Amino acid sequence: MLGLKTSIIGRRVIYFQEITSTNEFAKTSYLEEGTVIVADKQTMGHGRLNRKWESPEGGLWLSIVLSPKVPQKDLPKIVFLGAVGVVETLKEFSIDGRIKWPNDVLVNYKGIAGVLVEGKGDKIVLGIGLNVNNKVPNGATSMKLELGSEVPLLSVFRSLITNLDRLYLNFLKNPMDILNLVRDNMILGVRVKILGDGSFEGIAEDIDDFGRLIIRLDSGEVKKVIYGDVSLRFL
Amino acid sequence: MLGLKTSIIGRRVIYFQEITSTNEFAKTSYLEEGTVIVADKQTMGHGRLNRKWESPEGGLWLSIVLSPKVPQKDLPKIVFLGAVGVVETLKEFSIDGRIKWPNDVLVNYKGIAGVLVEGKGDKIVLGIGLNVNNKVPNGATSMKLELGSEVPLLSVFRSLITNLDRLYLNFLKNPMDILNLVRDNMILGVRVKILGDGSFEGIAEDIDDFGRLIIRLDSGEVKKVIYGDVSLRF
Numbered sequence: 260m261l262g263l264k265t266s267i268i269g270r271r272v273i274y275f276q277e278i279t280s281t282n283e284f285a286k287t288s289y290l291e292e293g294t295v296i297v298a299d300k301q302t303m304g305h306g307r308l309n310r311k312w313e314s315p316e317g318g319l320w321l322s323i324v325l326s327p328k329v330p331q332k333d334l335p336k337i338v339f340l341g342a343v344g345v346v347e348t349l350k351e352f353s354i355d356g357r358i359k360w361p362n363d364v365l366v367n368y369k370g371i372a373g374v375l376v377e378g379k380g381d382k383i384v385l386g387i388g389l390n391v392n393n394k395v396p397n398g399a400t401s402m403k404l405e406l407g408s409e410v411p412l413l414s415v416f417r418s419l420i421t422n423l424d425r426l427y428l429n430f431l432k433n434p435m436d437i438l439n440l441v442r443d444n445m446i447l448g449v450r451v452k453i454l455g456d457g458s459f460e461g462i463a464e465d466i467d468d469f470g471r472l473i474i475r476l477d478s479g480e481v482k483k484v485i486y487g488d489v490s491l492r493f494l
Numbered sequence: 495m496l497g498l499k500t501s502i503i504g505r506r507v508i509y510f511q512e513i514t515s516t517n518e519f520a521k522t523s524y525l526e527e528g529t530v531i532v533a534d535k536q537t538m539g540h541g542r543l544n545r546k547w548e549s550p551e552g553g554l555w556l557s558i559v560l561s562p563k564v565p566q567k568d569l570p571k572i573v574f575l576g577a578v579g580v581v582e583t584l585k586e587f588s589i590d591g592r593i594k595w596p597n598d599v600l601v602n603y604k605g606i607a608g609v610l611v612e613g614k615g616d617k618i619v620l621g622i623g624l625n626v627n628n629k630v631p632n633g634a635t636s637m638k639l640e641l642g643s644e645v646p647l648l649s650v651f652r653s654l655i656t657n658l659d660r661l662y663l664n665f666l667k668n669p670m671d672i673l674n675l676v677r678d679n680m681i682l683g684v685r686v687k688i689l690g691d692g693s694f695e696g697i698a699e700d701i702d703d704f705g706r707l708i709i710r711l712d713s714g715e716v717k718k719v720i721y722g723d724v725s726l727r728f
């Protein structure tokens with residue numbers, strides 16, 4: 260009854276009034292590529308390192324099952340597909356979303372969405388949490404808070420799915436194309452702190468041909484950051 | 495993201511851009527009670543006796559998984575829940591649907607919807623097909639044809655699911671209530687032709703406590719139909 264016209268993402272959609280986590284359900288269940296798992300609310304939503312992700316009613320909490328036929332070295336770019344898709348949807352609604360490497364989308368430096376990719380061989384789960392009409396943690400923001408009015412949740416869903424399908428199809432043909440889109444929508448030219456085994460500060464200059472964040476430390480030393488066990492903090 | 499407020503029916507909804515049949519999927523897949531299976535289009539839609547149910551884009555083709563812990567003899571009333579739900583939804587959109595025993599809904603005698611209930615040991619599948627904006631077979635009709643304008647398919651889905659959830663919850667407590675709602679919205683007091691071997695004609699008088707169609711033949715004989723097809727124009 261939804262009338263989706265996408266090629267892969269959205270071929271099937273499983274909706275839940277409530278769920279523990281769409282990412283956990285997607286990883287665990289036997290599902291076809293392109294299947295979207297969406298819930299009004301999550302009781303155990305999570306971010307990276309099982310950090311908690313608040314998922315109250317009013318937001319868009321979903322996961323997409325993918326089985327990308329691309330070299331193993333390109334799978335780390337899947338997170339960017341989600342981030343860019345969210346940015347394009349926000350722009351369609353006249354909201355200036357910007358990417359905080361490598362998985363977050365901010366509006367005026369306030370978190371409005373997050374992307375979590377979990378992979379297991381031939382199966383990749385692309386999870387996306389976007390604040391629309393829901394209440395949010397202090398510091399975060401939402402489409403409703405940004406626009407000053409409630410936003411039809413289903414319209415945002417249709418927008419995002421349409422964007423993701425297109426981005427995904429192009430990624431399968433040209434895995435590198437997504438990097439240019441990230442670059443054009445990412446927060447760069449500012450000082451950031453990288454937190455992992457220890458930490459260092461520098462200017463976030465750009466992302467390289469592998470999607471690694473390039474940081475120039477005050478000494479002039481250049482570091483290439485691989486996302487995985489590190490987080491980014493703005494100064 | 496649909497924000498359904500129903501208690502049982504619609505707790506989960508599985509949507510397909512295309513499928514063979516929502517009833518078939520529902521029967522062969524383990525699904526919690528209340529799960530709704532819906533598709534934009536079916537390539538092998540089914541009617542009774544495996545008749546074909548045209549299910550092109552624009553209509554509402556769905557199946558609901560049920561597991562009612564009620565007496566065995568009340569299970570034949572599930573089809574009525576689907577029929578009455580459709581009638582209620584049609585009324586909300588200013589359309590007067592009438593039930594043609596035991597599973598069809600007609601508007602001015604043209605078929606607009608059909609119900610197919612299939613029992614399984616593990617569950618009961620309530621299948622409902624309703625013409626909204628799609629092209630229909632000659633002799634049939636749709637909400638769009640009746641209203642003269644495109645009808646928001648999702649609005650119809652929300653309405654129907656809401657009505658069914660309410661009807662089902664009450665059915666679990668007062669299983670006989672559905673019968674009167676059926677009598678109130680069924681085509682009666684007219685001559686009909688019951689089909690199958692031993693075909694016969696007579697006045698469709700009412701339905702009994704088991705949902706059987708009561709027919710009065712011209713001889714005065716009274717027959718009770720458990721299942722079969724009724725023709726209002728022959």
Ligand SMILES: Nc1ncnc2c1ncn2[C@@H]1O[C@H](COP(=O)(O)OC(=O)CCCC[C@@H]2SC[C@@H]3NC(=O)N[C@@H]32)[C@@H](O)[C@H]1O
Nearest residue numbers: 280282304305306307310312313321370373386387388399
């Ligand atoms: N609703 C919210 N809006 C903005 N920030 C939030 C938030 N909830 C939590 N946060 C903050 O974001 C931090 C984590 O951000 P990270 O970058 O580590 O982790 C993420 O940003 C990824 C979040 C992915 C959530 C989606 S919802 C659908 C799918 N199912 C899931 O269970 N997860 C995915 C938390 O520690 C909080 O500081």
Ligand SMILES: Nc1ncnc2c1ncn2[C@@H]1O[C@H](COP(=O)(O)OC(=O)CCCC[C@@H]2SC[C@@H]3NC(=O)N[C@@H]32)[C@@H](O)[C@H]1O
Nearest residue numbers: 515517539540541542545547548556608609621622623634
């Ligand atoms: N789309 C349509 N609209 C009005 N009449 C139709 C129609 N398609 C077929 N018909 C006519 O109705 C007859 C069958 O009516 P019956 O009363 O026997 O059988 C029915 O009326 C029940 C139809 C149930 C269809 C739903 S769609 C979702 C679920 N999954 C399925 O595969 N099926 C269910 C066909 O033989 C045609 O004569």
